[PDB]
Amino acid sequence: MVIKFGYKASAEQFGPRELVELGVLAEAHGMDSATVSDHFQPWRHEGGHAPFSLAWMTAVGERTSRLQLGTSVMTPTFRYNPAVVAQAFATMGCLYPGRIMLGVGTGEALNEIATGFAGEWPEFKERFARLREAVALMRELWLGDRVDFEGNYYKTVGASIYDVPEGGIPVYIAAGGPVVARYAGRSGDGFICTSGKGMELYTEKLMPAVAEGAEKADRDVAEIDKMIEIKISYDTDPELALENTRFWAAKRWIVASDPDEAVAQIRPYLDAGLNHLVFHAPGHDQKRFLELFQRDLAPRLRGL
Amino acid sequence: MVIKFGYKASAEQFGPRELVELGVLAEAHGMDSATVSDHFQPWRHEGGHAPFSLAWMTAVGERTSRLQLGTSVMTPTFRYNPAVVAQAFATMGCLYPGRIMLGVGTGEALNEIATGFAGEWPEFKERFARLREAVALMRELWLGDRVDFEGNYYKTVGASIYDVPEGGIPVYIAAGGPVVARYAGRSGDGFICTSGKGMELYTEKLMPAVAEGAEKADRDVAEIDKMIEIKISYDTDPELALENTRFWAPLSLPIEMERAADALPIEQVAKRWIVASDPDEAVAQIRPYLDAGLNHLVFHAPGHDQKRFLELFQRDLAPRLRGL
């Protein structure tokens, strides 16, 4: 897939209007994508906010014309009905053709417990199985009609979605290990991972797992968009570059005031075959980040 | 509450982009509000749609500046988690200050069975108990800090919503009878009913019930917005005024059902619609709802050419209504 640079909006750090305006500024400053995590719980310590992700996506969508928008990620398996998730994303894709994706993961307990999940949090195998089932259900609604989906967890009866782009909505699967990454290679339209683990995670585990799955499924691996969230504090002021990380309380972060050093720290992800770099910055001044990214980092990255 | 005229956008009848553009046109043509029904299933097979209500509300909100937006109605009790509903509406309320409401009903089986609801469909008492519980949970979230809610149906654990307007989000309750109307008087920021059902429903059952609930809760009934969906087929062409009801024929009585609807005589289809081609006659048929004390009239027009309805409404009907 082609090289793309995007922006991760931090839902824990900003209220709804500011978050939306940052997504719009992301397009203004040349980003190819903007994504948001689907949190419910606002954590006082992570900044005290949690704007609803689908409202953010839609508001930014209606204000923009090029930018790809999605979740990174949302858990479609516990506090949501997967059928309704499919409806929401199908509608958004109609509203913003060719610019919507659905990024999904296997789930975090604390948000689900907060919203009323009953009993013991399922183990990884059940969480993963639920995710594959929900993905299939949603795609069946997108592609078919009068769907009677009867899974081990989820169900529909005569369900239809007419208001959907042809072929449905790209689904991006997040993975932090090879088991789910192989699933991404078999079944995802995209793959999402996070930076700042040793580089061997990407080059020995996750990218080979995606390629394996794509082989097993008889697909061309190049058609899978390979997204990485890169945590980066960049500022030309050396003190502000460092001080911006104090909101976030191998190295997990790139912390840099020199744009060539920053680019050097990003390059290894591109060399590992991640093509869709999504930048997540800690400072309160996100407008400055977007301006500095466009001015200093993007031209150097395209120059590689 | 002050008189307002708004627009019912038909999710049943238009796909997502067209529905959004109609919402925006409602504001351009002077409407005070626009609402949408929240269904999952396309309303009918032939020409049916179901765009996701919350995406419509947000996209119209981002395109507008004055219009009040809301659901009329959504069921927050079966395929939605009420805490997530509360989050969604609180976010929208922050995005569009003073312009968002949550309109809720007790629900209908077809949409829930479609989306996986298991077992016997609850009777009215249980659907209504679930609704009241969901509303209470949402309000606790909006107005509280770290909420531990545990009801018969719904639960939260240490849950918070901090991105919410002061005072929360207005909740409007759909009422077809006195029991729910009294609850709207006690607890609703508004109530919603639909026209065409015989004037005694509004004057003898629903309005007095809202007033009684308000008095029992020590509220001023004037603070409750009294909304009615006015089913009106206005067109200066009398053939269109009648024939534009056709899409809605399923209301006037499975693939057989729809064949049966398409074959209904148009007079039968049009029975509970105001059909008018003269603007004074139209207004005469609207006026009894104002006289009954409904203050927020949301006009629902049946035909495919909704831009023409909005232009006609602004030209012919709004000035006459303001003149009452």
Residue numbers in the entry:
A (entry chain B): 1 to 249, 280 to 334
B (entry chain A): 1 to 253, 264 to 334
What does the paper say about this structure?
In mycobacteria and other actinomycetes, glucose-6-phosphate dehydrogenases (FGDs) seem to be the main producer of F420H2, by catalyzing the reaction F420 + glucose-6-phosphate → F420H2 + 6-phosphogluconolactone. Since the identification of the first FGD two decades ago in Daniels’ lab, only two FGDs from actinomycetes, namely M. smegmatis and Mtb, have been characterized in detail. These two FGDs share 37% sequence similarity and belong to an F420-dependent enzyme subgroup within the luciferase-like hydride transferase family. Rh-FGD1 is strictly dependent on F420 as coenzyme. Rh-FGD1 was also found to be highly specific for G6P as electron donor.
We have focused our exploration on Rh-FGD1, the best expressed one, characterized the kinetic properties and elucidated the structure of the apo protein at high resolution. The asymmetric unit contains two enzyme monomers forming a compact dimer, which is also observed in solution as estimated by gel permeation analysis (data not shown), similarly to the mycobacterial homolog (1.0 Å rmsd difference for 610 pairs of Cα atoms). Each Rh-FGD1 monomer is comprised of residues 1–334, forming an (α/β)8 TIM-barrel, with the active site typically located at the C-terminus of the barrel, as observed in Mtb-FGD1. Only residues 254–263 in subunit A, and 250–279 in subunit B lack clear electron density and were therefore excluded from the final model. In particular, the high - quality electron density clearly indicates the presence of a well-ordered nonprolyl cis-peptide bond between Ser72–Val73 constituent of a bulge at the end of a β strand close to the presumed binding site of the F420 isoalloxazine ring. All attempts to elucidate the structure of Rh-FGD1 in its holoenzyme form, i.e., with the F420 cofactor bound, were unsuccessful. Nonetheless, the obtained overall structure is substantially identical to that of the F420-bound Mtb-FGD1 and the architecture of the active site is conserved. In Rh-FGD1, the sequence for this structural element is shorter than that of the homologous enzymes and corresponds to the disordered part (residues 254–263 in monomer A). In Rh-FGD1, out of the three residues, the position of Lys258 is unknown as it is part of the disordered region.
